[PDB]
C-alpha cells in the first residue's frame, strides 16, 4: 500500500576459408564477452569471398589498444584504421 512502509517493493520497471573466418569472428566475440564490452551485432556479408563483422561500442584507449593487440595475436582485419594480416573479417568499432 502507498502509505505503508512497504510501498514500492514490487517496483521492477526501473531495473529493466569462410569457416575459418567464422571461427575467428566467434573467438573475437568470446574475447569481447570476457573483457566486458558491448557486442552490438554481427553480419554475414556476401573464386569466392566471405566477410564477418563484430560491431563494438565503448572502450578506453589503453584497453582498446590491448584488445587490438590480442586480436592481432590466418586471414585479415579492418576497423585510426588498423589493418593487418597473418576469407575476410571486419570488426567495426565505435569508441
Amino acid at each position: 500500500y502507498k502509505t505503508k512502509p512497504t510501498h514500492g517493493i514490487g517496483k521492477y520497471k526501473h531495473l529493466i576459408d569462410m569457416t575459418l573466418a567464422e571461427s575467428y569472428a566467434q573467438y573475437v566475440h568470446n574475447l569481447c564477452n570476457s573483457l566486458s564490452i558491448k557486442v552490438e551485432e554481427s553480419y554475414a556479408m556476401p573464386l569466392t569471398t566471405h566477410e564477418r563483422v563484430v560491431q563494438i561500442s565503448g572502450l578506453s584507449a589503453t584497453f582498446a589498444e590491448i584488445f587490438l593487440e590480442i586480436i592481432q595475436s590466418g586471414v585479415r582485419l579492418s576497423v585510426x584504421x588498423x589493418x593487418x594480416x597473418x576469407x575476410x573479417x571486419x570488426x567495426x568499432x565505435x569508441x
Partner: protein, 57 residues
C-alpha cells in the same frame, strides 16, 4: 564404430584440456598488462600531470 568413437572422445577431452590452459595463459597475460598500466598511470601522476592527461586522451 566403437573403437573410433572411444578414440574420438579421448581426443576431444585432450583438446578441451589444452584449450583451458591456453585461455588461462591469455588471462594471465592480460592481467600483467593491466597491472603495468596501473603502475604506469600512478608513475605519471607522481611525475608530470600534463603528460598523464595527454596519455589518457
Amino acid at each position: 564404430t566403437f573403437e573410433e568413437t572411444e578414440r574420438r572422445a579421448l581426443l576431444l577431452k585432450k583438446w578441451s584440456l589444452y584449450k583451458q590452459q591456453e585461455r588461462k595463459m591469455e588471462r594471465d597475460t592480460i592481467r600483467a598488462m593491466l597491472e603495468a598500466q596501473q603502475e604506469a598511470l600512478e608513475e605519471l601522476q607522481l611525475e608530470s600531470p600534463k603528460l598523464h592527461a595527454e596519455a589518457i586522451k
